[PDB]
């Protein structure tokens, strides 16, 4: 069952996919049991990396943008984004 | 138009495959191999999450 599978993936990865808080074009990726860190992304051309908690330095943000637009790897973006957000907390 | 269809597409693309018929998770790997984590044990949620993420990146 799709919703049950989602619930299980959320519990295993502690990764929740939510609507953007600010805009309709953003996807918010929330990491952690308590939802302690998050990052928003958009593919509407105005920007790629949106807001995040904790906020990240320009070099970290440029690496994340490159993983999405140059390598086109959504998985590697989530692994790197998760590492950066947890390390910067 | 369920957002659960696209969410599952995202979760599978991470290389994490649910195999509940065998009470286990398949983690696609660093070395290009398959890691299998059972779910029918006393493993905490915290350990299982740590185990999975550690095997998705370099």
């Amino acid at each position: 069952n799709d919703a049950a599978e989602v619930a299980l993936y959320e519990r295993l990865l502690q990764l929740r996919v939510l609507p953007g808080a600010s805009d309709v074009h953003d996807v918010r990726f929330v990491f952690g049991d308590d939802s302690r860190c998050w990052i928003e992304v958009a593919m509407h051309g105005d920007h790629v990396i949106g807001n995040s908690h904790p906020a990240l330095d320009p070099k970290s943000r440029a690496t994340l943008e490159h993983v999405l637009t140059v390598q086109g790897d959504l998985a590697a973006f989530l692994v790197v984004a998760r590492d950066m957000l947890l390390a910067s907390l | 138009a369920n957002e659960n269809i696209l969410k599952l597409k995202l979760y599978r693309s991470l290389g994490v495959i649910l195999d509940l018929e065998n009470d286990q998770v398949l983690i696609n790997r660093n070395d290009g191999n398959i890691d299998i984590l059972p779910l029918d044990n006393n493993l905490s949620d915290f350990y299982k999450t740590k185990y999975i993420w550690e095997r998705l990146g370099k």
């Binding site: 996919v17 939510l18 609507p19 953007g20 309709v24 074009h25 953003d26 996807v27 992304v41 958009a42 593919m43 509407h44 999405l68 637009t69 140059v70 390598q71 086109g72 790897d73 959504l74 | 138009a1 369920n2 957002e3 696209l6 969410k7 597409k9 995202l10």
Partner: peptide, 19 residues
């Protein structure tokens, strides 16, 4: 592993999540 695919996928997901 393609930027056009990730672009259209994230466009699709933000649309469904916003609805």
């Amino acid at each position: 592993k393609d930027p056009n695919e990730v672009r259209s996928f994230l466009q699709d997901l933000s649309q469904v999540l916003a609805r």
